């Protein structure tokens, strides 16, 4: 009969009812692949436009069967098998990418089982391709959520050490591998005789005898991460670092944002289980035993929740500013006495800083003197205070924009030839040369990630590169060639470089808390909201500009022979034309109102999003800054260039004269032969007191999770416990 | 057979390729939907009751003392 009311609303509406090893690999014929390989022609016959072997079609079309035949039949060694799986595509995919590039659990579980057993020789899941993608980064990009978990369980298993023998680090290795062996549990091998499960040889070599399932039992849940954070700590690892590492595994997966928010809430719960500073720097410190620093990993992976805590902003402040000079602004005595000492000691800086850089490269009693300080760090040895190194940088920054705006307010139409070079116009070309040297050894030494995600390094290139290009193209446009329109490009390169300098000079407000989260906003509603609304307006404005030309074009018909009279009303008795241009320009003004209304509501969205995080972004941009200057030398970019020249000369001398001398002024900023803090690697009987004080903190953290995971085990059965206390009430029994 | 249809929007094929299982896929999907939605329906029975026990919390405590009144 007719269906239900639900019937005709939800039910499905419509009515329904070859010679190569490659095409025997993709279809999955085992024996046809075995016969034709006994004639052969290769085992890596690769087709042309995409560089796929006969292996990478089994990984493509989900045949673990004939990948397993080759591993049984046609292989000699470990080194021969890995040459087959690491045979890249034309994009660069190995065997493990192609099985994670598209959801093929049954092939991915074969490759992982070949990797748990140690039958490889390279980390097959850590290799990259042309785009730098990964096997874990392809499965997260495409979104195959069932091969992401299988890659999560492998990286959680591989964290735990196989060498230690503790009964709770061997239980949770058995309960991660058997989460994968029960995940396959079907899909037997190609031989119909000797049949065995996938993770046979891995659960065997683990030494643990265990003395209608739910989806709480076949997935990684929050009680499964807690079994790893304890067992990594019980086996000996930094518990603050295992939480940061397991977090950045789950941010890579993009589909476990309910577990990322828990692991973040444990690195903020462990971080304020501490009381003193002595307990903060006991769990954040590396030792000889675990050399793992978690502070340096958080500001490498931009960890805004850790890196702006009360206790992390306290261990940076007692190195950046141990004297409180940053609070000599909130008083009248502070501005007068702090300001007057600044213009004195910046006048004293610019006259002695060249004389120290020369007399430190070949005047060795000074280089052993300039290393003194830097553990006391305060006003006794003022060149090591990291706040003061920042103040000299901002003073040598405003000096460039005063000496550049004086270069343009002191131009005249008076003398062409002895004004192309000057004591001022050539001095700034050396200055901008030494900003470009500064950005090279910033880029080379840190890397492309922290360079582009920084303060104003991209902007400080362009104001330096366009002034040099102003300086060169003015020299060779007076003498080499005579004169052209090339002289008017010269006035644009100095107009960019004078604009970008004053907008660079609002980095003196990186530390203000009123003018600080206002510059970071105005950067962000200008590099996001305006460069994506200008692409929309360019399509609209080019449509009205075409439509005006179709509205003013002529059609000239009054002639008896050919082409004699022609009606003129172009701009791009006949009182009809102006009527149409008025109505057309009204439709453009309604369009301009409708887009100025969408631009202002676009920006008020961005104000609401960057100001709900005002004092977390600020305390993160501060601590990326307090860590950058604590490793940086006191030579600002105007004397960056003198330091490279005297150290290239002054260390070439002590290769001819005395040999194993050492202590050279190293030709890099951001010194590497310094742990960031002085409370790092604690040799002696301070190691024994940290390890006691760490184990007090972490053991009191791990049983406030074990309490808070017990209350959630009771929230799940709250309507079952209420029914049992109500019956244990004296209806039945007392 | 297989003549070019002049009608666009091919109506024979379903939307996705995983729509109608035919066999062991049908027996596995039934095991997966019972696994998922029986733990959807449990965690609504608990979460509705918690809002009943919030608003009516001094009446459960009063029933535990009312038994001193009767028995």
């Amino acid at each position: 009969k007719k269906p239900s009311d639900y019937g005709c609303q939800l039910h499905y509406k419509h009515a329904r009812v070859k010679g190569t090893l490659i095409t025997a690999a993709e279809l999955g014929l085992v024996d046809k692949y075995r016969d034709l390989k006994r004639a052969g022609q290769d085992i890596l016959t690769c087709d042309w436009p995409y560089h796929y072997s006969s292996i990478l079609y089994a990984c493509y079309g989900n045949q673990y069967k004939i990948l397993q035949m080759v591993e049984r039949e046609f292989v000699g060694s470990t080194q021969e098998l890995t040459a087959m799986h690491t045979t890249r595509c034309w994009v660069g995919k190995n065997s493990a990418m192609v099985a994670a590039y598209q959801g093929h659990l049954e092939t991915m579980l074969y490759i992982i089982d070949l990797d748990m057993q140690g039958k490889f020789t390279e980390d097959l899941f850590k290799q990259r391709d042309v785009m730098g993608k990964n096997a874990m980064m392809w499965a997260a990009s495409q979104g195959h959520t069932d091969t992401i978990e299988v890659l999560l369980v492998r990286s959680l298993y591989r964290l735990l050490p196989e060498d230690c023998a503790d009964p709770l680090v061997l239980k949770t290795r058995w309960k991660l591998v058997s989460l994968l062996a029960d995940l396959a549990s079907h899909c037997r091998d190609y031989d119909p005789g000797c049949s065995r499960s996938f993770f046979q040889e891995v659960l065997a070599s683990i030494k643990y005898d265990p003395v209608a399932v739910k989806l709480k039992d076949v997935h990684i849940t929050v009680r499964t991460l807690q079994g790893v954070i304890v067992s990594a700590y019980r086996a000996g690892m930094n518990c603050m670092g295992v939480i940061m590492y397991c977090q950045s595994l789950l941010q890579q997966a993009r589909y476990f944002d309910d577990l990322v928010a828990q692991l973040t809430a444990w690195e903020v719960k462990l971080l304020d289980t501490c009381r003193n500073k002595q307990e903060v720097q006991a769990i954040l410190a590396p030792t000889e035993d675990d050399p793992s620093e978690p502070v340096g990993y958080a500001l490498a992976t931009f960890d805004k929740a850790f890196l702006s805590h009360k206790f992390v902003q306290q261990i940076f402040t007692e190195k950046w500013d141990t004297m409180g000079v940053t609070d000599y602004t909130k008083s009248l005595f502070g501005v007068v006495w702090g300001g007057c000492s600044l213009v004195v000691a910046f006048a004293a800086w610019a006259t002695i800083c060249p004389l120290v850089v020369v007399a430190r490269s070949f005047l060795s009693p000074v280089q052993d003197f300039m290393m003194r300080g830097k553990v006391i760090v305060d006003s006794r040895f003022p060149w090591h205070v990291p706040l003061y190194r920042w103040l000299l940088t901002q003073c040598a920054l405003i000096t460039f924009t005063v000496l550049l705006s004086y270069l343009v307010f002191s131009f005249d139409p008076s003398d062409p030839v002895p004004a192309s070079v000057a004591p001022l116009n050539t001095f700034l070309a050396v200055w901008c040369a030494a900003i470009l040297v500064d950005e090279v050894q910033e880029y080379v030494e840190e890397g492309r990630a922290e360079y582009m995600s920084s303060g104003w390094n991209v902007m400080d290139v362009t104001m330096a590169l366009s002034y040099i290009l102003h300086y060169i193209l003015r020299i060779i446009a007076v003498r080499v060639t005579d004169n052209l329109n090339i002289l008017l490009v010269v006035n644009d390169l100095l107009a960019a470089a004078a604009l970008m300098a004053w907008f660079r000079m609002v980095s003196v407000f990186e530390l203000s808390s009123a003018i600080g989260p206002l510059i970071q906003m105005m950067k962000q509603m200008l590099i996001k909201d305006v460069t994506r609304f200008a692409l929309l307006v360019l399509v609209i404005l080019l449509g009205f500009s075409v439509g005006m030309e179709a509205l003013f074009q002529e059609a000239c018909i009054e002639r008896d022979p050919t082409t004699n009279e022609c009606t003129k009303y172009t701009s791009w008795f006949e009182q009809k034309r102006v009527t149409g241009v008025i109505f057309y320009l009204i439709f453009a003004i309604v369009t301009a109102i409708l887009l100025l209304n969408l631009f202002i509501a676009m920006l008020a969205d961005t104000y609401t999003r960057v100001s709900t995080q005002a004092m977390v972004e600020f305390r993160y941009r501060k601590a990326k800054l307090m860590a950058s200057y604590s490793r940086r030398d006191f030579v600002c970019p105007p004397f960056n260039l003198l330091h490279l020249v005297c150290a290239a000369v002054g260390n070439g001398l002590r290769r001819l004269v005395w040999g194993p001398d050492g202590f050279t002024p190293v030709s890099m900023r951001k010194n590497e032969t310094v742990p960031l803090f002085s409370w790092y690697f604690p040799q002696g009987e301070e190691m024994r007191q940290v390890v006691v004080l760490q184990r007090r903190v972490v053991d009191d953290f791990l049983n406030s999770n074990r309490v808070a995971l017990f209350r959630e085990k009771l929230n799940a059965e709250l309507p079952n416990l209420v029914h049992e206390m109500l019956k244990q009430k004296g209806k039945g029994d007392g | 057979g297989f003549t070019p249809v002049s009608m666009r929007k091919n109506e024979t094929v379903p939307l996705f390729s995983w729509y109608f299982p035919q066999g062991e896929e049908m027996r596995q999907v039934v095991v997966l939907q019972r696994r998922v939605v029986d733990d959807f329906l449990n965690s609504n029975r608990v979460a509705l009751f918690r809002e009943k026990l919030n608003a009516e919390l001094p009446n459960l405590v009063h029933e535990m003392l009312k038994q001193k009144g009767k028995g």
Binding site: P719, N720, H723 | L41, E63
Partner: peptide, 29 residues
């Protein structure tokens, strides 16, 4: 339902799946 939700559930849905307290509310005052 009082006998199926007597010890955890015999409706296979952890209880009788439409059964709670309603211990009983009073009037008073």
């Amino acid at each position: 339902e009082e006998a199926a939700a007597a010890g955890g559930g015999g409706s296979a849905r952890e209880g009788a799946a439409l059964h709670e307290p309603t211990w009983g509310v009073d009037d008073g005052e």
